[PDB]
Design a protein around this nucleic acid. Sequence first.
RNA 1: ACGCGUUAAGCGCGCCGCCUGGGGAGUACGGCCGCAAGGCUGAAACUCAAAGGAAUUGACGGGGGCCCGCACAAGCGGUGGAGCAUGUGGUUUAAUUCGAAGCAACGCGAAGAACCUUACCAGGCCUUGACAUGCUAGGGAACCCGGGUGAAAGCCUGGGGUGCCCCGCGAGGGGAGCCCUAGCACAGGUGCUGCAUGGCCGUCGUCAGCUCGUGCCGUGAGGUGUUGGGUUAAGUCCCGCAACGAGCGCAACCCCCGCCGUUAGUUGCCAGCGGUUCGGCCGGGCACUCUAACGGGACUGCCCGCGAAAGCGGGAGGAAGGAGGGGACGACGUCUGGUCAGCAUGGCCCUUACGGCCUGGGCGACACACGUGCUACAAUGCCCACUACAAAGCGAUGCCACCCGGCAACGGGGAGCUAAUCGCAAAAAGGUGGGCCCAGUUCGGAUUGGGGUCUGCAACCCGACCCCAUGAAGCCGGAAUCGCUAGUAAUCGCGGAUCAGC
Lengths: 206, 60, 117
Amino acid sequence: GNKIHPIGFRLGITRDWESRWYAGKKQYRHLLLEDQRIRGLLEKELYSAGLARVDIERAADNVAVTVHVAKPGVVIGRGGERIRVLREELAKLTGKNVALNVQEVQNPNLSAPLVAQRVAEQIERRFAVRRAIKQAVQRVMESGAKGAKVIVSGRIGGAEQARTEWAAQGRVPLHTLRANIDYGFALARTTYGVLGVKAYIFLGEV
Amino acid sequence: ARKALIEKAKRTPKFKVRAYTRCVRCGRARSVYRFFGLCRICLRELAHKGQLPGVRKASW
Amino acid sequence: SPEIEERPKKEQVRLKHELERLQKYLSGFRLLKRLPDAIFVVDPTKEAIAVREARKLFIPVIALADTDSDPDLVDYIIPGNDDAIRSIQLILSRAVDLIIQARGGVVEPSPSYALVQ
RNA sequence: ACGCGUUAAGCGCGCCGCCUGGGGAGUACGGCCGCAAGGCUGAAACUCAAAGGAAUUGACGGGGGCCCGCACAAGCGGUGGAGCAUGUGGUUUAAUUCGAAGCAACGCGAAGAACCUUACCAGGCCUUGACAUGCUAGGGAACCCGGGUGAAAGCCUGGGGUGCCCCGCGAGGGGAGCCCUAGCACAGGUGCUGCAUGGCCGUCGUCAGCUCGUGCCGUGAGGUGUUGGGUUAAGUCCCGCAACGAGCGCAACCCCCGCCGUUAGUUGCCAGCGGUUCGGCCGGGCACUCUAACGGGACUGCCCGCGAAAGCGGGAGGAAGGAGGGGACGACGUCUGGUCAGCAUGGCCCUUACGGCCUGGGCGACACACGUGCUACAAUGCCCACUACAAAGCGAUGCCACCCGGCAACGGGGAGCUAAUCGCAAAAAGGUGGGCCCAGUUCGGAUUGGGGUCUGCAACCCGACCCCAUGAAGCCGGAAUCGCUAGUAAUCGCGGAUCAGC
Ligand SMILES: [Mg+2]
Ligand SMILES: [Mg+2]
Ligand SMILES: [Mg+2]
Ligand SMILES: [Mg+2]
Ligand SMILES: [Mg+2]
Ligand SMILES: [Mg+2]
Ligand SMILES: [Mg+2]
Ligand SMILES: [Mg+2]
Ligand SMILES: [Mg+2]
Ligand SMILES: [Mg+2]
Ligand SMILES: [Mg+2]
Ligand SMILES: [Mg+2]
Ligand SMILES: [Mg+2]
Ligand SMILES: [Mg+2]
Ligand SMILES: [Mg+2]
Ligand SMILES: [Mg+2]
Ligand SMILES: [Mg+2]
Ligand SMILES: [Mg+2]
Ligand SMILES: [Mg+2]
């Protein structure tokens, strides 16, 4: 049981925050609880679109909420029918004026939490646990990455004894601060318990 | 017990000293940093993700 | 290049010393970029790992060889003297005559006298 | 296969002896031989699914060689002794909730157990439930204010109450919110399984390793690379080499601390000069100090010696050399490690109870045993007074200056401060003076009687603080045993988190 989170290891450099709002020592508490039940609701009713980051900013009773997705089409609805429903759902808990940009992740095979989700999705549809990994990495290397690595936990294929499958390609230098390693994690609630999917994508540098 | 209780701790009680903290996520009594409403665990977690603004690995 | 001025400190030795070795071994080998059609070997016993590979790949083996060596695994043998700088010279050069002379326009008997003595 | 290889275990011919799974067993029987000891010949029943040979990768050795680490040595201070604090074992209990178990459990989860917390017990209670989404149905449908009863929860109650859909009616009935009771799907379970799991962690170990691609070698497992020589903190680099490269590691990229520069003036200053009720306080000035952003600076770059090279010893310059000092950072894997009681989660179990609510007690028990700690046992010390050493953090349900009352804790008042501006804040050790004079003491402050203060609904079981009295063991600790290589150990105070208080 070793090893730090690669994002948290990098926050000051080669990775910046999912929440860029100052607060004093008595708002922070609530501007967080909100901040969170936000993602709690967004992530839950927005899986289809496939959301990577759920970026957020503030400046006193207004909120940015720049959601990044692979399939913008799905958040909008043909015209603007869903994006309305969401701005409306938000302000019922967030007693403030909820702004809301939307972004396309131009290549979703280089968004680690998408790759995780992908593989996690396959696992729940009893797929070939070891080839999923194999393919996923390939796909990620195929879309031009510097390296990748995927890990699945245990009860692989409903087996009685927990195990751990991994695969990787190129470089994934977890100790280099100046690396830029999108990391991502997906669950996978199956008929025979949870599996855990981790995904690492090396791209960056100076 | 940890449902009937996440509920009870929110109710305003007879006597303010019966009152107490709770990790507003990970629903929990002990090591609960009042500047966040966050259990040391459900906290190291967010702190890592970038979901706690300006919070960073300290090293000195 | 523009990066004969830059590159981190410990990389104008790290990278530039890597080029030294690559320069040292891959001077003449830098030329052929498909397997050759033959190999000319000076002492096939000294150079046995090379011959091995040739034969393995069905590349013919020319060699200046001598009592040292097993002739049977040299295709085109020149029974001579793998040691004398004279012998290596006489043969190696005149063979490179033929090589240019199959293409026209031969040159001098070559810069091939180190400080010969 | 190891190996054999004109001294074959190669290629052939002749002739002899022998083998035919292991154990029973070289046993029994018979025969022959022998002085005897015994020898030669040599079974069966029963019974096993192997017994074997060579080689591979490891692991191990009371085998070898090379080398590391506060591993031992060299030191300085500890524990084990005493009192007390604390965690644990045991015992006890109605309950003393649960977990953690050598290192890597035991001041651990607990960064805050009087009620809360709380998961335990005893009693009084609620059951569609403290919480989520829906369904079937008469009753009322927003809501407000009491009373009885009880420890509280809850339960039995008497009133105030008519807003909105609908106009379908000019006489108001139709389960629109909403709220009730009666059923139903369900909630709820800190119930069990960490050997069904995720996640996160511990751990060997910040140890110098673990691998891959292709090539090469072997029938093969596998090997080579990664062995060898040098070198390093390092699989760090160097030289060699059937390997050539690469990846996860190492290092570096990041933060703090050392030196200087740039940018910046409600904190710095007679640095300069002026005024000063002589407090940087006043106009004034960023020079300096600092504050915090950005750069510079170190490269074995330079000189001597050794070396093939990496690199090694020494010298100069420089605030700083050869990794300058402290962090962050944990390879493939190992331990069926840890946690289902943070959370998440597969399965099994409880559903007028294994759910819930409450009051009270318990987690604080005490014949005992252990771990981690505090305070000591004194004169290099104890006590009292005076006396600027300065250095990270907290503070508007707050930090509280300053006055006054009280021996005091604290209580009255009351200014400043959203805080480099005001407060917590005294730093303590030190320094200067005075006392004690080697005593179970003016050392030590346990225990205990009494009087108080504060937080809190409430301090018996169970709080901290102050004051009077009372002054226990303790004279440096058995066998065992712990930490630390430098701003370290040793020692002295200071802050924070949790938090009403502790
Ligand atoms: Mg409390
Ligand atoms: Mg031989
Ligand atoms: Mg037999
Ligand atoms: Mg053997
Ligand atoms: Mg072996
Ligand atoms: Mg010693
Ligand atoms: Mg003791
Ligand atoms: Mg348990
Ligand atoms: Mg386990
Ligand atoms: Mg686990
Ligand atoms: Mg256990
Ligand atoms: Mg082969
Ligand atoms: Mg290396
Ligand atoms: Mg070495
Ligand atoms: Mg490193
Ligand atoms: Mg176990
Ligand atoms: Mg109770
Ligand atoms: Mg306890
Ligand atoms: Mg004495």
